[PDB]
Symmetry: D2
Amino acid sequence: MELSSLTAVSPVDGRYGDKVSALRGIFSEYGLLKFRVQVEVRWLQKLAAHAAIKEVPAFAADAIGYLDAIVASFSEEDAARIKTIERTTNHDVKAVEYFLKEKVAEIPELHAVSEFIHFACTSEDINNLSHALMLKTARDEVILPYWRQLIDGLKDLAVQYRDIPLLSRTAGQPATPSTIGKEMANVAYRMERQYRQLNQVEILGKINGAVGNYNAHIAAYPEVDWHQFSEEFVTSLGIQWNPYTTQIEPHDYIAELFDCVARFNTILIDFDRDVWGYIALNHFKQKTIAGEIGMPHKVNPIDFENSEGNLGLSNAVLQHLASKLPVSRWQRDLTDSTVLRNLGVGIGYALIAYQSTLKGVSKLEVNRDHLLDELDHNWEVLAEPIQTVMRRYGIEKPYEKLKELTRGKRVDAEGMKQFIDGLALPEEEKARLKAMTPANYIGRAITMVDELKHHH
Amino acid sequence: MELSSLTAVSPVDGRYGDKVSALRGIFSEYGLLKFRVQVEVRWLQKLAAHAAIKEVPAFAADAIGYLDAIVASFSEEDAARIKTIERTTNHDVKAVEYFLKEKVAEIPELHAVSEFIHFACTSEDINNLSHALMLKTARDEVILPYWRQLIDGLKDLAVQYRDIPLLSRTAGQPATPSTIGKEMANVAYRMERQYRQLNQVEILGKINGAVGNYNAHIAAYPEVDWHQFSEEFVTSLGIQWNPYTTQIEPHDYIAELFDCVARFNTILIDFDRDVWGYIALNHFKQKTIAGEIGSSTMPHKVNPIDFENSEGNLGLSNAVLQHLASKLPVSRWQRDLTDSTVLRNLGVGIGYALIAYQSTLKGVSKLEVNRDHLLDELDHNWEVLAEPIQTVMRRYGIEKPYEKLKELVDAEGMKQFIDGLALPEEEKARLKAMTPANYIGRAITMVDELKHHH
Amino acid sequence: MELSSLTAVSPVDGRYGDKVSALRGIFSEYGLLKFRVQVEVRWLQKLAAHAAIKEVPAFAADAIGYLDAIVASFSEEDAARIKTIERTTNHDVKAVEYFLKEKVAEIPELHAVSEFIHFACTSEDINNLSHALMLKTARDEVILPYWRQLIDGLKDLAVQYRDIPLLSRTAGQPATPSTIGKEMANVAYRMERQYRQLNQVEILGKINGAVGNYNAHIAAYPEVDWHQFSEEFVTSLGIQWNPYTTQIEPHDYIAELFDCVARFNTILIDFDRDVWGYIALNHFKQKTIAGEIGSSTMPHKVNPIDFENSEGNLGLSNAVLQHLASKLPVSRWQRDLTDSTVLRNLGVGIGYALIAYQSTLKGVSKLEVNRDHLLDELDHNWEVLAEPIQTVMRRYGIEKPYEKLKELVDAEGMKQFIDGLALPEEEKARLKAMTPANYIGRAITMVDELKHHH
Amino acid sequence: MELSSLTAVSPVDGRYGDKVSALRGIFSEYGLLKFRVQVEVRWLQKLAAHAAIKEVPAFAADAIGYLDAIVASFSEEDAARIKTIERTTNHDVKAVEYFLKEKVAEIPELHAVSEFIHFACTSEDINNLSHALMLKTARDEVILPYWRQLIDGLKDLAVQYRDIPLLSRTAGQPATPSTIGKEMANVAYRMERQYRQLNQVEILGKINGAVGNYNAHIAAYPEVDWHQFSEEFVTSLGIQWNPYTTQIEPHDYIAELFDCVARFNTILIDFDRDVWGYIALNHFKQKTIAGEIGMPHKVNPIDFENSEGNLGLSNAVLQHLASKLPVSRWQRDLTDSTVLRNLGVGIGYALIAYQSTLKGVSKLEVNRDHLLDELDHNWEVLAEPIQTVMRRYGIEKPYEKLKELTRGKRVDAEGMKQFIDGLALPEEEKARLKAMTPANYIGRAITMVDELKHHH
Ligand SMILES: O=C(O)C[C@H](Nc1ncnc2c1ncn2[C@@H]1O[C@H](COP(=O)(O)O)[C@@H](O)[C@H]1O)C(=O)O
Ligand SMILES: O=C(O)C[C@H](Nc1ncnc2c1ncn2[C@@H]1O[C@H](COP(=O)(O)O)[C@@H](O)[C@H]1O)C(=O)O
Ligand SMILES: O=C(O)C[C@H](Nc1ncnc2c1ncn2[C@@H]1O[C@H](COP(=O)(O)O)[C@@H](O)[C@H]1O)C(=O)O
Ligand SMILES: O=C(O)C[C@H](Nc1ncnc2c1ncn2[C@@H]1O[C@H](COP(=O)(O)O)[C@@H](O)[C@H]1O)C(=O)O
C-alpha cells in the first residue's frame, strides 16, 4: 500500500497527521535535506567572501542570488533527486554534495568552484547544524506558542473560577477547601517555570571536520584561522557555538531541551488527570456537539484522555533520545544518525496532546451547584480551624479533642456548632467559628489567584 | 505540505517506509478499521447462525458470501468512507457500524437485520479483538519470519566460521581463545529461546459488553448463554479467550508479547555491538559496492553502518515497546480512554524492530572474516597459555601454580617454563604442542552440536 | 555514623528493613558469599565422586559431612573472614577460594585435595550459579508466597462482595453496573496468569570455564567429558542447564523473571489506584485503631496510606527491575564487568515489591465496604438503564432506539418511556422491573465461577 | 539477620556502604527526622519572635539555647524515640511533634507554648523543607565536589597527554588523528557545562498549610500576613520560595536537579566506555597493586566498569523519581512520601561511580609506543588531507581519485607518497604533503587543549 494518512503505521503521520503538519517541513527527511542544503550553501558563500581564500573569489550578485534560490526554493522534487543520487552513494550527505554540484554546473562562476562545495567538511558538520536549526525552529515557532496558549488558558480558568469553592482531596479524601481557580493557578505557575527554562536552553552547533580538530582545513589552508572561522559560521546561522567536539556535536543540549519538554509534559499529565477526576466527581460538565456520539447517556472527557495518552508516548521518546544520544563510541558511532531522524516524533506526540488539552479545556463547564452541595456535606473539615483556634487560646488537647469528635465519624453543621458552643473561648472568636462554613473556609485562595500576575 | 514518504514526520513512514510496508495493512488506521469490520461481520454472522436468536435468521450462501467479500475486499476507499462518517459521529467504531449498514442495504436478507449489527456490543468488544488480530498477524506473518531469518543467518555464520580461532576479550582484554563460529552459535541459541517464547505468548480477546458482565445481552436475550457465546466467538477468530475483563481487555498479554520482543532486540543490540567491535579490530572486513561512498571526507572508509542503523533502531523500538507494556495494563476503574490513542502505536515499536532486523541482515551479508588478522593477533598473545599450564601443574600437584604463572612472553619463553616443570614428558609434550590458535577447547564441537538442541 | 536501620541510605535496609529481612540471607553480600561457598563445595564434591578424576579420590562420609556443614552453617563471621581476605586479593571469588582452603585444612582427606578447590573454574562459573540459586530461592520461598497471599486475598474479597452492586465508571463516568466482587475477581484472574508465568520461568546456570569452551578442563583432563560433567553439575543444584555461554551466563532468564514480576506489579498498581479511588468515592471505609493519627492538621482524616505506600514502591520496583532486565543481557564481547556490581542489586527491585505487597495486604485488611453509599449512588443514576431499554427495543424492531434514548431522568421517567413502547407487556414488565442496583448482568455468577478456571 | 554492611540487601549500604557514608546523615530516616526537627524548631522560634503573635512571647536566651540544642544535638537515640512514638501514631510527622513536646515539657517557658509546636502546619510543610535542605546539602557538600574532582582530573589528563597522537575511531574505524589530550578535553568541557547547570538549579521550598492556602493560619490569626511570613521563613532557611503549591511542593525542581545529574552521569558513562576501549586497544596500560589478583595474566579495567554499571543504576532511579514525583492526584496522593525516602539512593549509586572512575583514572598509564605504532600502520588516513589540497588547487575528481586508491585497500607510506609525487601541484605543497605522517596530521588538537582554560 502507498503511504497516506490512512495507511501510515504511526498515528503521528496517520490519524493525527493534520495536527502536526508544521513538523513536516522541519523534522522529516525533506526538512533534514532542506536544512543541510542551507548549511552547505552558506559555507560556500563564507569561503568566497573570505579574502584569504582566493581560490574562491567573492561571488557576483547573480551567483549569490542563484545560491540563495537553491536554498529558498528547495523542493520535494529537489529532495527526490538527492534520494535518487543516494541510491548510488549509499551516503546521504555525499548525495547532497553531488546534488549541489549538479545545480551549480550551469553557472560558470559557481561551477568553477564546484569542488569547494563541502570543502574540508565532515557530514556531521552539516548534520549537527541542521539539527540545531530544526530544534530552534520547532521551539521558537511551534512548541513555545502552544505552551503560551496552555499557560494563558490555565490563567483564564484561574481568573474565571477564582472564587468558586472546592472540597480539596488529599490522599483522595475530603480536606481543607480551596477554590477551582487557585488549583488552576498552581498549574499555570509550574508551566511558566518550564517555559522560562525551555526558552533559556542553549541550542549548540559546531563545524570542525572529521574528528573536531580542523585537520583537513589546516592541511590545505594553514594560514587561515579556522577556529575563528568556525565560531563565525555557527553564530552567523543563529546557533550558539560548541568549540569542543569529536566528529559529532555531543548532543547534551538536546537532552537539556528534551528534559525540560518532558517536565512540562509531566505537569500537563498531572493536569489532564486532575481534570479527568474533577469531571468524574461532577465538578465540571462538558459541552456537547450536535451529531456526535459519546451507553447513549455518557459524555466522556476524551480530549484530556487523548492528551494524557500522547504525553506518555511523547516522554517515552524524548527521554530515550535524551539518555541515548550523548553516548557515542570513541570519536562517534553512527547509531545516533537514525535516532536523530526521530527528533520530531517525541515533539509530535506532545503537540497532539497540547491541542487535545486545549480542546478539552474549551468544553469545560464548572458545576458550582455540585461543588457547593458537596462542601455542605463535609463539615468535618472545620475540625482543623477549630483546633487551631483552640491552640491559640490555650485550650488543652485541641487536636486530640477534634480527632475524637470527627475521625471516622459523620458530623453535620449542628454537631460542629454544638462543639464550638462548648469551648471556653472569647465570645467574638466563638461567633467567628460558628460563622464559617466549608464553602467559606478557603483561606487566601482568592487573593492568591488575583496576585498570580505579580509573579514571573 | 501534503504527506509523502519525504515529508513524513516519523522515519518509520518516511525514510524507512519501504522497509515496513507490511505493517501498513495491519497497525495503521486502515488496518484497525479493516479488522474492526471483520469482527463486526463475524459477530452478525454468529447471531444469524444461533438458533435461539430468531430475529436474525440463518443467512443463505450468497449473503454469507457478500459479507465475506466485505471483509476480504476492504479497501482504502471503504476506510475513507468510514472516516467521512466519523466526521459527524466523532466516534470511530460507530462510524464502522454505519459503514456496514450502508454496505448491506442492497441485500434484502442482510438489510432486514442491519439493526443487529453491533448488537449488545460495546466499542471495546470490537477494538480488543481487532488489536488481537493485528498482533497475531504481525507475529505469525512478519515478526517470526524475520527472527527465523536472523537465527538461520547466525547459524550459517557459526557453521561457516566453526574452526576460525579468536582471541577472546573479557573486560576488553586478551583472554582464553574461542572460535568465531562458537561466538555466533551463542547468539543463535539465545535468539531461539526468545523465538520459542514469543510463539508461546497467548494472544487474548474478549467480548462481554459495556463493563464485562453481558448486561445488555442478558437484558434482551436472557435465555441465551452469552458466556458460552463469548468463548465460541473469540476462539472462532483464532484468538484465545479472556473471560474476565472490565470494559477493556486488560492488555497483560500485549506486555507479555512486547517483553519477549524487547528481550530478543536486546540480544540483537548485543550482537550489533559485538560485530561492530570485531570490525573495529579488523577481525572482519566488509564487502563494498563500486559507486558507494563510505565517508564524505575520508575516502578510505568502510563503515559498519548497517549494524549501527540496527542498533539505533533497536533502542528506539524497546523504548516504545516498554512504554506500551508498562502503561497499557493500568486503566482507571472500569477503564479510562488513554489506551485508545496509545494502541494506535502498536506498530511503531514493531516497525523500529523490523527496520533493525533488515539492517542487521544486510550487514551480515557483507561480512568477510579476516583469518590472517585473527591468527596474527593470537600469535602475539601467548600469555593466554598460562591458564592451561597452570591447570596441568595443579593436576599433578606442582605447588604454587597460579603464582609461578601470575608472577612469570613469547613461544620460546612459554616453552622454557614448561620444560622446567616436574611433569611427565607425555604431559610436557602436550603443553609444548599447544598454541594460542589451537587452545580453543571444545569450541568447534560446540558449534557442530548446536543443531542437536532446540 | 555507623550503619543501622536509622542511618541506612536506602529505605529497603532502613525504614522498611524489617519488611524484607528474608532477603538479607539471599541477595546481600553475605548471601552471595554463602551461595558461592555452596557452589565451590559441590564442585569439589563432584570432582571427588568422578572416577576418572583420580587426583581427587571419593570422599568418606565424615569429610562429606564436614563439607556439608561448611555450606549449611555458613555464618556472618565466615563472611567477615572472606572480606578480610579480599582486602588483600581485591578479588571476591578468589577470597572465597582461600576461605575454603583454610576451612578444610584440618581434615587431612580434604586438605590433601585443597588445590582442586575451584579446579578449572572461572569466577563467573561460581557467580552465575550463585545468582541462579538466589533467584530461585527468592521466587519459591518469598515472591510466590506473597503472590498467593494477594491472589487469595483478592478471591476472598470477590466472594465476600460478590453481590454488592457498583455503579461502574468508564472514562470516569457513570456506566453499566457491576458488583464489587466481580471487579475484585478480575484482578485475581490477572494475578493468577502472572503467577503461572513466573513459576514457569527457567532459572538458568552454566559452568564451562573462562570463555565457555572448557579450555582449561580439557587441557588437564582431556579424557573427561566436561560437557556432560557441566550439565550434571548444574542440574544437581536444581538449576536448569544453559550449554552455550561466553564467560558469563547471558542473563536472558533474569530479564524473563523480572519482566513477569513487573507485569504483576503493574496489575497491583492498577489495583492500588482503583481501590484508592473507591475509598475516595466512599464506596469503602477503613478500619481505624485508637491512638493512630490520620493527619497532623486535619483530625477527621482516615487516609489509604497502605495502598499509596504500595503504589509508590511498585513504581520504584519496576524501575529497577526494568533497568536490570534491559541492561544485564548486553555485555561487551566475551563479557565486560559492568554486570558484576549491577547483579548485587538483584534484591533491590524485589525488595521494593515485597514492601508493596505487604502494604497492599495491610490495606486490604482494613477495608469495610459501604453498601449504603454504593446503593444510594446507583439509585441516583437511572440513566444507565438506557442501555438495556435500547437493546430490548432493538430486539423487537423498534426504530431509532439509540436515538430515542440518547436524545431523551429518574425512575418514574424511565418508567413512562418504557410504557410508551411498542413491546409486549411481558417485556415491558421485565424492563419496568429492573433498577440500576439489579442491572448487574452476569456479575454474581462470574464471581461464583472464578474457582473453575485456573 | 541483623542489618550490617554484610547483610544489607542493597549494596549502597552494603558492599559500598563506606563509599557513601556522608549520605547517612542526610537521606536516611535519621537525616529526614533531623531536618524535620530543625524545621519545626525554627518555625516555633519565628512565631515567638513575631510581635503580632503575642500568645507566643519572645524567648529568653536560655530557652532559645535549649531549642537550638535540640536541633544541633539531634541524635540516633532521639530518632529512635520518635520511631517509638510512631508505633502509636502510625504518622511520622505527628511523632516528631510529640517528641518535641516531650523534650520541651521540662522548660516552663517552652512547655507553656507547647501547643504552638507545628502550629497551623501540615506535615508537608515540614517534609518539603526537609527535602530541600537534604538536596541542597548533598549538592553543595557532596555532589559538586566530586564533579570538580572529575573535571580537574580530566583536565589534568588533557594537559598531561596534550601532544600524544591518537588514531581516531569513527564508526569504530581508523580515522583522522587527534591527541589523547584533546579527547580528554572534550569531556571536561561537557562536564563543566553540567556543573554550571546543576549549580544554577533552584531548590524550592514552601509553607502554607493543608492545601496551600493558609486556611488554618488565617482562621486563628486573620491579622497576620501569612504569605509574607511564609516567604520569610523559607528564605531564612536558605531555600528559594515556591508561593504556589497544593499540599505538597510540586517537586518540579527535583526533576530539574536529577535531570542534570543524569546528564552528567551520561557523559561519564560515555567516558568510562571510551577509556575501557582505549585500554582494550592497548592505548593505556593499568598500574597494578602487589598482592591483588586480576587467567593469571590479565589486568582488567574494573574501576571504569564498576563506575559504568553504577551510573546506569543511578540514572534508572533518578529518572524514575524525576518523572514520577511531579504527578500527584488532586491536592496530592501519598505515593511520593515513600519514594522521596530514596532521594539518596540515586545519588548514592552516582557517588560510588564517581569514586570508581577517579580510582580507575589514577591507574592510567598511556602507551605512547602502541599509539604511535598503530598510527604508522594507517597511512590511508592521509587520503583526506591529500584530496583537500587537490581540491584547493583545482585538480579534478580529488575525493574520487583518493577513494579509488584507498577504500578497502591497504596503502603504506611509500604508496601514499608515490601518489602525491604524481600530482600536478606546486612543488612547495607537494613537499608539505610528503612531510606529513598519520602521527603529525593532528590539526589543531594541541592548541585546542592549551586553550581549554580560556573557556568557562
Ligand atoms: O564525512 C563523513 O561522511 C564522515 C563519516 N561518518 C559519518 N557521519 C555521518 N553520516 C555518515 C557517516 N558515514 C556514513 N554516513 C551516512 O549516514 C547515513 C545514515 O543512515 P541512517 O542509519 O538511515 O540514519 C548513510 O547514508 C551513511 O552512509 C566517517 O567515516 O566517520
Ligand atoms: O462502547 C462505547 O462507545 C461506550 C464508551 N467508551 C468508549 N470505548 C471505546 N472508544 C470510545 C469510547 N467512547 C468514545 N470512544 C471513541 O474512541 C475514539 C478515541 O479516539 P483517540 O483518542 O484518537 O484514540 C473516539 O472516536 C471516541 O469517540 C463509554 O463511554 O464507556
Ligand atoms: O575468572 C576470573 O576471575 C577471570 C576474569 N574476569 C572476572 N570475572 C568475575 N569477577 C571478576 C573478574 N575479574 C575480576 N573480578 C572480580 O569481581 C569483583 C567486581 O567487584 P564489583 O565491581 O564491586 O562488583 C572484584 O572483586 C574483581 O576483582 C577475567 O579477567 O576474564
Ligand atoms: O498534616 C498532615 O499530616 C496531613 C495529611 N497528609 C499527609 N502528608 C504527609 N504524611 C502523611 C500524610 N498522611 C499521613 N502521613 C504519614 O506519612 C507517613 C508515610 O509513610 P511511608 O509510605 O512509609 O513513606 C506515615 O507515617 C503516614 O501516616 C493529609 O491528611 O492530607
